[PDB]
Every structure is written in structure tokens, then in C-alpha cells.
Structure 1
Amino acid sequence: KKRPEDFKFGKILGEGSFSTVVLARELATSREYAIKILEKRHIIKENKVPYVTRERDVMSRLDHPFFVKLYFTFQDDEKLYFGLSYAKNGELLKYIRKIGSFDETCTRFYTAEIVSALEYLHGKGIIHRDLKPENILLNEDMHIQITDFGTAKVLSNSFVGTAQYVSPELLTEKSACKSSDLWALGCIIYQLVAGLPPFRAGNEYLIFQKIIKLEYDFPEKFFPKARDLVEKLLVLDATKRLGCEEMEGYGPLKAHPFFESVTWENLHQQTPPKLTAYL
């Protein structure tokens, strides 16, 4: 039964559309948390409560090493607070920007960790819907910590994610499936190898046009096995993407030649490779 006074608020880690994530140290224990702060007035005013509820619902269901954990929640007169795990190393995007094109060892390790985390998520009947490097974080040990579930979809038509990673079905039919996250995974693998996402244009309208037309090109340098995987993920028909139900699930995706040498069991217990560039 914590309150804002139990913590000393430090540096701002990140900013959301209606939220701020701050590093906080618990006075009693000296333990660090990333506390997500939401102004109640703003959330009531902009009708943002269902997003707060969705993130609360989604996060309370997950218990996996590759996801940011929700520890506690409290509030005062003005603000609503969420005590989350601290991912010391920031966003995976920061390293994409810092180093550019990643080597094969690095690409394989990180792709495998994202594949492993998606399998968990999809097996729980949850679709992320906005999977991107900005919301794939890195903890002290350099292991992935996926976050940003306010816009996720629980299974038992609304939201459109970041334009570079949107699946064609989400644009056209307005409905996301688990396979929509596999499209984002293809975009992320390309980005790790190439240093840039596959669909690039002057504006969002022009990016969407390239998505629906499958208008992207591979650079010469691109790893042959990673290129094969990307071609098997960036497929217009969502029932023909490597990893989906219709395609026999995660097993054949984990079996893809790109993952040769990956021990799928306990990846979070394996030492990640030092992040190295490929020139």
C-alpha cells in the first residue's frame, strides 16, 4: 500500500501520448522502479480511461522475462501511478540509431528473443498492435523487456499503430490478428539488418501506399537467411506468414535456417552478444 511520498522521483525515462515514465527510488528499500504517471484530469477529459484499463488488464496477465512487469498501482488527488520494472538500457531503437546495421550474431539473438516473447503473448490471446523498436526495451543484462500495452488487443475496428510497422489488413480490413505482429517482426528484422525500416516515404499516406503494394527493396549487403525470413513475414496474405496458425504456428518459424544455433529454451539465461555493427 504505497503512496508517491514513499519514492524519490528522478530522471524522466520516456513520454507517451498522455503519460510520462520516471525513474523512482523507493526510500525504504533503495529499489528502483520506472513509475508511469498519468494526470487524472487529462485522462478523464480526453476519454483515455479504456486505454489505462487495457494496459492494467493486459499487464496483470503477463509473467515472462521478456515483458516489463507491473508491480503496484497508487494515486493521489491529481495523478495515477504504475510501478513498473526498470529497463536500464533504454529502447532498442536507441542502439539502431547509435550503431546502424547490426551483425548476424546480434540480429539472430534479438530477433529470437522477440520471436520467443511473441509466442508467449499470442498463446495468451493478446495482440500487441504497435510492436516497434521504441517499445522493445533493454534491461541491465541486455535482455529484451517489451512494453506499451494500452493499445493491445485481447481476444476471447479501432486503433492503427506506427505507420512504418502497420500490417496491410489493419489498413484495409481495419482488423488485427496475431499475424499482424508477425508483419511488424519482419519490419523489425529488416530494420536491424539494414539500419532503416522497409517502408520509407515522404509522409504516412505514401508509406501506407508502399505497404499495400508490398513496395520495398533489399540492399545488396543484407544477410541471405535474414532476407529469406523477411520475405516469409512481409506477405500481403496474413494466413501465409511464417509463424501463424494456418502455417502451423511458432515451431516452423523457430525452425527457419536464420535461427540455426538458437537454443529456444531459456534464452533469458543466455549471455547476449555485445552489440556489433556490420559495415
Structure 2
Amino acid sequence: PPQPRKKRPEDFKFGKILGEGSFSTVVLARELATSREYAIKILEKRHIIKENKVPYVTRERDVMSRLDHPFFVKLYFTFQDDEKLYFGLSYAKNGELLKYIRKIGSFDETCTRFYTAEIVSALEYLHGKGIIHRDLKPENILLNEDMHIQITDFGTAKVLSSFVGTAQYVSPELLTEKSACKSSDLWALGCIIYQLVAGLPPFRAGNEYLIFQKIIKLEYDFPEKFFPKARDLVEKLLVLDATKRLGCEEMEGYGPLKAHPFFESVTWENLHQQTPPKL
């Protein structure tokens, strides 16, 4: 079928910077013809080539095109000019989950349960497509205007059929084997649940090396104020042996994870249609 013609920079009014890395910048843009807002990721070709990032850029475009689920930032279009590639992404107006953790300190049980359930439901979808995120963290779990999650940042994803993520959420197997699997994302999930409840990531230290040391030793502990059922769930995700994490294939997948007592009151069928709890 015929699709709309390529967009170009002049079709947009660019605004504020939404996010930044050493190889790309995400900028809010309003499409003039439609008044729609997009988060446009701008990548300078020369720099990407120079630093050998072509496979990562290609990976993100491929992944984010293929995903069709409300809990994921969508890639709507791409275009380029002489110097730059542009990716038109969903604009998640409320920004990072990290911002909310910092703002409110830690989440109550109702909010922890709901947002954890959305993240689990997103991973079920992603893993069902044979894709591993590999760098899941509250910085790339965004919140849309309606306060549902939208997960982004897929250049480092792996597609089943090399790279080490953010220190605090790195799984032990990446430190001891250099090998990621679906279960690496479930480890990150365990860290994120811990952070929602405690207000801080479970493996913390003065520098990267010391964090990694704690991870491989499973050296962390729970505060006294930690929802007991949430603690049990986290203990079943933060497991050194990757084949023993709740939710992984060797543990028979998402059924037993979603059945965990922490999720008792959750209706998994239509989370996106439910109204999120007030933070």
C-alpha cells in the first residue's frame, strides 16, 4: 500500500531536549500539519560511523518498528538529511519512572503492584517476540500522559534466533560469562521492584567495580519496611542462577510469575485500560 511521504526537518517545530547520550539526542517536536507531538531522536551519522555504532542504531530501528504494544515507545517514522538520522518516537509526556521514584521517595504497595504488573506484562510481550532488552531500568521506563508505562531505548537489545548495561541493574551472568538471556531482564525487574519499594537500587557502592562485586556475591539486603510479598517476589528474581528466576523458560515462564501472591489482586488482561493509582 502507499504510505505517507517521508517527513523532513521542516515539517516540525523542534522544542526542548528530552534526553541525551554521547551519540544521540531526543528532542520534543510538534508536527506542523497535525499538531502532533513526537520525541524525535536525532543521530549524527559521522559520529555513529566513527564510533562503530551502526549495528546498535540499526537494531533499535528494527526492534522499535516491530513492536506493537501500548507499553512500548513506538517508532512512527524515520528520515535523514545530509548530517543526521531522525527517528520519530512516541512522546511520553510524564518522562522517566526514575523521576517519580525520586520525587515521592518510594511507592506504596498499590502503586508498586500496578507498575510492576505493567512492566511484567511488557516483558511478557517482548520476550514472546524473542527480544531481550538488556538495559532495563527506571530511566528508560517512561510514563505517558495517562501515567501508563512506555518502555524505550532498544539499541542495546538482543534478538534471539558484547554489551554490559547500567551497572546497578547488570545481571551476574554478564559479569561472569558475558552472556545475556531473557532472564537477564527478569534480574533487572527484581532490581526495579526493589527500588520502587525501598526508594533505592539494591546493589549500591562507591564505584562500578564495587557494585559488580556485590552483584556476583548477591550482597544486598531488605529494609524492615518492605512489603513481605514483594520481598518474596524479589528474592525469586534476584537469583544468581539465571535458570532459576521466576518468569524464565526453565521456570515455565510468565504463568507462575503472574501467579505470585504479590500480584493477587491484579487483572492482567487489560492493564492498559485500567486507571493507574495516584502517586
TM-score, length basis structure 2: 0.97
Deviation at 1:57, TM superposition (A): 1.1
The answer to whether residue 30 in structure 2 is matched with residue 8 in structure 1 is no
CA distance in 2, matches of 1:44, 1:212: 35
Deviation at 1:133, TM superposition (A): 0.1
What does residue 3 of structure 2 align with?
none
* CA deviation string 1:45-81 (max 9, x = no partner): 1111111100011111100000000000001111110
* CA deviation string 1:68-122 (max 9, x = no partner): 0000000111111001110000000000111111100000000000000000000
What does residue 76 of structure 2 align with?
71
SS at match of 2:106: coil
CA distance in 2, matches of 1:243, 1:3: 43
* CA deviation string 1:125-177 (max 9, x = no partner): 00000000000000000000000000000001x00000100110111010000
Deviation at 1:44, TM superposition (A): 1.5
CA distance in 2, matches of 1:130, 1:143: 20
Deviation at 1:266, TM superposition (A): 1.1
How many residue pairs were aligned? 274
Q: What is the root-mean-square deviation in Å for CA atoms of aligned residues?
A: 1.0
* CA deviation string 1:217-250 (max 9, x = no partner): 1100110000000000000001110111111110
CA distance in 2, matches of 1:17, 1:229: 36
CA distance in 2, matches of 1:217, 1:248: 27
Deviation at 1:17, TM superposition (A): 2.9
CA distance in 2, matches of 1:46, 1:236: 33
CA distance in 2, matches of 1:211, 1:264: 31
CA distance in 2, matches of 1:17, 1:136: 20
Pick the aligned partner of 2:184 from 172, 176, 180: 180
CA distance in 2, matches of 1:203, 1:247: 33
TM-score, length basis structure 1: 0.97
CA distance in 2, matches of 1:19, 1:147: 14
The answer to whether residue 203 in structure 2 is matched with residue 199 in structure 1 is yes
Deviation at 1:40, TM superposition (A): 1.3
SS at match of 2:203: coil
CA distance in 2, matches of 1:132, 1:7: 30
> Superposition pairs for residues 39-188 of structure 1, below 5 Å?
39-156=44-161, 158-188=162-192
CA distance in 1, matches of 2:136, 2:218: 19
CA distance in 2, matches of 1:170, 1:216: 18
Pick the aligned partner of 2:226 from 212, 215, 222: 222
Any stretches of 5+ residues in structure 1 without a counterpart? Answer: none
CA distance in 1, matches of 2:66, 2:33: 28
CA distance in 2, matches of 1:202, 1:25: 41
CA distance in 2, matches of 1:112, 1:242: 14
Q: Which runs of 4+ in 1 moved over 2 A?
A: none
* CA deviation string 1:245-278 (max 9, x = no partner): 111110000000000110000100000000xxxx
* CA deviation string 1:7-46 (max 9, x = no partner): 0001111112310000000111111111000111111211
CA distance in 2, matches of 1:262, 1:162: 30
CA distance in 2, matches of 1:21, 1:214: 35
CA distance in 2, matches of 1:240, 1:30: 49
SS at match of 1:96: helix
CA distance in 2, matches of 1:10, 1:230: 40
State the identity as a percent: 100
SS at match of 2:7: coil
> Superposition pairs for residues 231-250 of structure 1, below 5 Å?
231-250=235-254
* CA deviation string 1:155-206 (max 9, x = no partner): 01x0000010011011101000001100000000000000000001111100
